[PDB]
Structure formats: structure tokens, C-alpha cells
Amino acid sequence: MKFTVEREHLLKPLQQVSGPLGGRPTLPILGNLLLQVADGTLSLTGTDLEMEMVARVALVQPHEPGATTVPARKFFDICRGLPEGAEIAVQLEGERMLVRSGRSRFSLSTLPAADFPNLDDWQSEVEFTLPQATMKRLIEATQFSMAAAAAAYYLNGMLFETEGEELRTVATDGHRLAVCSMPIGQSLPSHSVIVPRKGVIELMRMLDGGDNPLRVQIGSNNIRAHVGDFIFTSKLVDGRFPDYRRVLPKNPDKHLEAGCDLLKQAFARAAILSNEKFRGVRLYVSENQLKITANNPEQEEAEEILDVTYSGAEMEIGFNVSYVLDVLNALKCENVRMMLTDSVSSVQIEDAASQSAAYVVMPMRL
Amino acid sequence: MKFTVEREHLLKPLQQVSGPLGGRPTLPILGNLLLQVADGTLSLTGTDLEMEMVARVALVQPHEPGATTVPARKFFDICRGLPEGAEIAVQLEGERMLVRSGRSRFSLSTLPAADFPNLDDWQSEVEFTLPQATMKRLIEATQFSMAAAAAAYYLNGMLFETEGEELRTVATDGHRLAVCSMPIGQSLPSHSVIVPRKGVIELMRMLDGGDNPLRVQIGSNNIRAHVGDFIFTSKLVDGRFPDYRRVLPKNPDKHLEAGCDLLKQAFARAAILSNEKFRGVRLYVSENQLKITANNPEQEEAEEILDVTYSGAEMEIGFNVSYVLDVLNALKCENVRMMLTDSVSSVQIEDAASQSAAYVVMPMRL
Ligand SMILES: [Ca+2]
Ligand SMILES: [Ca+2]
Ligand SMILES: [Cl-]
């Protein structure tokens, strides 16, 4: 195995394929990347046994085919540390891989390619293309509502659902839910899969900001996304996502509309004096007005009064203010609409201008 | 106590007297700020018992004199959380302090001003004024050489020394030393004091890079710095400080000169393959060339060769790379000069083109 490549052709690929890796790896091979030279191309692969990210790098200087694995973060730091435009030459030598650029020389310890984990081949059931921007919208709109380490495995993931001309994402942690749907311009079979939380992070990481479209393929147990010269593949979370469609409030008649940033800043201040553990705030809605109040066990109190659009019955309802702030922070909009039912029922929140995304937050005791 | 003030006028004072972002102050009153209205001014005071920061704001709107202490972080967050342009009206009300701006209202728990700590009256023995930028340069050139935070050395602050027309700072952790001296335009008595590590950080935090005179007053047991409308006071550390004159290598017979950036990048790269828990490199100096090498327990090896100016016998010497990198980062210059003696003696490092600061570094055995 031998190649020589300019530093910057290697740097973004290396940065990307280190993502599946941790601090200390569970076992040494998992802290390595696989390097393969075949058909004029260097391919670099990182894996965590659940997903893999592969980057392909065209080679325009002389090379010899072969494969090995080397410590990912050491190899990346070497490459990042060399001067702009350095030429980096690599040669496999059994138990070590040698790297040379100008008069800088490194020897890294290898483990055999044959021993690098190789996710199994699989068959796609659906395939589509979409703008990178659409995928970014779909993930950003919902990612925050994923569980961080729930007992219920299925909540530590994001649902992707194709249905007709729409792609939709759903995330929930048992307490709040987010759902976003976007037009695909393509007619698709009904599919519903759970992408693992690390997979979602990686999908996000791989989007650059260009009009290279994203190509997605979904199978019974796996998903793959190709952008430019990067291909991400993950196994799916085996499980049935709960049916959130039956969780959206049925007849949520009390409509409040207000400025998103005005609400956000008001909640943000009220939160200072909320219980630091339980984070409860009280909303009192009345004719064209919202009053937000917080207090903590030490009897400190905040109160914010805002003008809003509201004509329903007065009601008072408590919410975890961090859940509310997460939604307002995800909505990127001028005005928000909250749809209320009664003091013991969840609220649905949406951008006033769009039904693309909906958020449901269960209320809390105070 | 009653005052009304622009949020604008409070932001920097609150930032100064408040943080120390975090960290959990283990003695509850110390996480409070003392507010005082008297002779047309609001004064805000933060303290940790060892030091204190006082900020003053002029009050042009109707105000009434008085006390109180309130939670600093809470009060800062509320002020910071209000809209640009806000006016903040405050009225003390027994066990609560009311803060009101627009239709935002807060009531904070108070503790009695009379419970807030001291600090007692002390007498200056030396006073001078210097540009705050001169103080900034002196601390920044040397701060990094102080021991940390249990390390548990014996010396836990920076020496401030007045001699002739210069102010000088010296910091050492027993392995490396930094010294910087700046002229201050006034002839001064010979005086030497130790400022505690956390005092040095707070002092540094107060300084702006504006042109602004800084007035310093040093007593037997305390130091005070006044810039603008902020006054910082710290206790001093008792006991002896080593004499930097006695640590400076007495007769170096080996002179290395090299580009500061090239040297830094070469140390940084070799260091990738040094032992992680204890990152050192070996330097081998010979005519016109510097070879830097590193290796780790996995028997990975790095070698960097640089062209340099070098006069002296061939020699091999090892260094802890963080100590050297810290010096090159502090110099921020074109070329550096290293003055060497032998494999087991300290080196001196300085900017080849200025003599305001000098660094002494002990070698490593590898
Ligand atoms: Ca495979
Ligand atoms: Ca005092
Ligand atoms: Cl497995």
C-alpha cells in the first residue's frame, strides 16, 4: 500500500471519518481507521460496529494498492499539524505505516485490514434523492427531543418515515415530542425506520452546505446516505416507534399566537427563578394576554406579562420551561402558535406560518 | 434602597463583580453581591474573602440610599436577560428586593448588608500608576509559569517587583520560570510582593486593552488596583520567593536560533507520538540543524528536522513539550533564541529581537 496526497485532500475526509470513534475505544481496532488503495482511490472508513462512514479520496500522484488500519486521531493530528499544501506520503510496512512530509517522519502501529469490522451487505427497499438542506431542516427540527439514554431503547433514536411525496422525522423522550414533514418531489413507498442517535449526529455532520444532493437508501435493517464522496451507513434500531399520530391533541381549540423571540426571552427570564431541578413555570392565558410566572422552593418569584392573540377561555397550566425553550429555540420563526386544551392536557406548538413542524409538550405538576 | 438605572450601565459592572462563572461557592454569602446606594452612586461588591471587586455606577434618576445583598448570578442573569434599552427599577422591601423592567417583575431573596464580609482597612506602602496595557503585558508574559492548583508546590502566586523605573513579574513552578520587566516612567523603591494565583487571574480579568491609567497600591499584606470605576483588592501571600537572578543560566556556551512558528509546529507534531501521560521530546543539536524526536509505549516514533542557526558542541537534551510550547506561545514572535549549557542544565529562551521577557526551562530525562 503506498500513496502520496496533498494535505487538504486528506484533511476533511479524515475529520469526517473520525466521528464514529470515542475517547478511549472499547478495543484498540475501534480507535483505528481502515485505509484502502484500490483503483486509483484511497478510501478511509471509521466504524463503531453500528455505523460506518466511508470517504473516498481521488489519487493523482503514483500509488500502490493495499490496505491497513492505523490510529484515527493520531493520523488526523499528524495531517492537521503539517503545513498548508504539504505533500504527505504513506507507505505500509507490515506492523507499521510510515508517513513522510518534507523532513517530518512518523511511524504508526497497524492492525490488519482483515480484522477491521465490516458491516454486512444489505438490500435497499426504497431510494430517493433530496437537497442536503431538506435533510438538515428535518434533523434540526426534531433532534433535541430525542432521549438522552432512556431505558426504552426505541426513544434513543429518530424515526424516519417516507409516505407518498413526504419525508418525515419524529423524536420523543416520553415527555415531549417533535415531528417535521417535508415534500420530496418523489412518490415513495411507506417505510418507517429508527435511526440510532449517534447515526443522526453523523448524518448531520456529513452535510456541508452545497447543492450536492443527498441520496438515501433504506432497507429492512439498514440505511445509507451518500453526499459527494462520503457514504454513511448505519444499522437501524430494531423496534416499533410508538404511534405519535394518536398523541397529537385531538381538538386543541384555544389558539394563542405571539412573537417567537418575545415569548422565548420571557420564558428565558422566568426560568431564572424556577425550581432548578423541576423547572416548572405557570402560564395564565386570558383575553389577549399571556402571564408567565415562576417560583422556586425559596419563594423567589418572576412574572412576565406579554400581549398575545388569544380569545379562548382563561386557563392556567404548568410546563417544564426547558422543554418550552427547546421548542422555541428550534422554531426559527417570526410568530408561534400554541394550541391548548385544558390544564391537564398537552400543548401543541407550531410556527404560526407553517404546519411543517409540530411539537407537543406534556404539562407538569405545580 | 431604591434606584432606577439603564441595564446598559449595569452589564459590565455585574460581569466584573460576578464571575468566576460557576463554580458553586461553598460559603453561601460569597455567592451574593452587596449593593449600596450612597452619594449618588450604586456600588456593587463581590468577594471570596481573599479578594474583592468593587464597581461603581453613577445614578442620575431619583434614588434612595441603602443596602442589601442578593444572589449575584441570579441578578446578573435577570439584567442580562432583559432587552437592549431596558430600564431597571429596584426597590428593597424587607426580605425581598424587587426588580422591575417593562412588564417583567422579579423578587429576589436578600441577606443583610451587615452580614456581608469586611475586608478591613489596610495601609499602602508603595503606589504607582501605569497604563493598564503595561500590566496586561507583564501578566500575560508570565502567568502560565505559575504552578497550578495542587500541583501543591509551595509557591502559589506571582512575584511583583519594583526596581528603579521598572515593574517586573516572575512566575515559577519549580520546573520552568518566566520573567518580564517593563519601564513605568517613575523611579520607585525596591519592593517585592507575592500576588496569589486567583488574584492574578481576577486582576487580568479587569484589564481592557483600552489606554486607561491603572493605579496600583501595595501594602505589607494587600494589593489594590483601580482602573476606571473598578477597584480590585487582594491579600498577598506571605513568605519567600526564589531569586530569578540565581535561576538564570550563568554561562551558556551553546546558542540556537530558529523561526518561532516553525519550531512550535515541529514540537507540536513530534508531540503527537510522545507518551500521552508525560509528553516529552528529544532535541539533538548539531551544526545548522535541529532534530526533534518522540516515541511512545506502542513504539510509534516521530522525527522533525529543522534548519537553524547553531553555534556550539553537538548535544542531546530532552524537554517536556508543554513547557516549550507555552514559551513559544507567550513570545508570539518571528525568531527565538535558546541558550544552552549541557544535557542536564536549564535552558534560557527569549525572542531573538526583544529582551523584555526571558524564560528558563529545566530539561527532561527520556
Ligand atoms: Ca461492508
Ligand atoms: Ca473594606
Ligand atoms: Cl453487534
UniProtKB/Swiss-Prot annotation, chains A, B:
Summarize where DNA binds, as residue positions: 24, 73
* Keyword set, alphabetical order: Cytoplasm, DNA replication, DNA-binding, DNA-directed DNA polymerase, Nucleotidyltransferase, Transferase
Cite the residue spans of the region called 2.
Answer: 129-243
Effect recorded for residue 135 to L: 3-fold reduction of synthesis of beta*, probably due to loss of its start codon
Question: What's an example GO BP annotation here?
Answer: negative regulation of DNA-templated DNA replication initiation
Instruction: Provide the biotechnology use note.
Output: Small molecules can bind to the hydrophobic cleft and inhibit binding of various protein factors, suggesting this may make and attractive antibiotic target.
Q: Where is this region: 3?
A: 245-365
For this chain, one GO molecular function annotation is: protein homodimerization activity
Chain segments carrying region 1: 1-120
InterPro entries hit by this protein: DNA_clamp_sf, DNA_polIII_beta, DNA_polIII_beta_C, DNA_polIII_beta_cen, DNA_polIII_beta_N
Q: Where does it primarily localize?
A: cytoplasm
The reply to whether Transferase figures as a keyword in the UniProt entry is yes
Localization terms from the record: Cytoplasm
Where is the signal peptide, in residue numbers?
none
Q: What else is known?
A: The temperature- and UV-sensitive allele dnaN159 does not grow at temperatures higher than 37 degrees Celsius. The global SOS response is chronically induced. The UV-sensitivity of dnaN159 is dependent upon Pol IV (dinB), it has an enhanced Pol V-dependent mutation rate (umuC, umuD), and is absolutely dependent on the polymerase activity of Pol I (polA) for viability.
Spell out the PANTHER family in the cross-references: BETA SLIDING CLAMP (PTHR30478:SF0), DNA POLYMERASE III SUBUNIT BETA (PTHR30478)
Assembly with partners or alone: Forms a ring-shaped head-to-tail homodimer around DNA, which can be opened by the delta subunit. Binds interacting factors in a hydrophobic surface cleft between domains 2 and 3, each monomer is able to bind different proteins simultaneously. The beta* isoform probably forms homotrimers which probably load onto DNA. The DNA polymerase III holoenzyme complex contains at least 10 different subunits organized into 3 functionally essential subassemblies: the Pol III core, the beta sliding clamp processivity factor and the clamp-loading complex.
**Protein name from the UniProt record:** Beta sliding clamp
- Gene symbol? dnaN
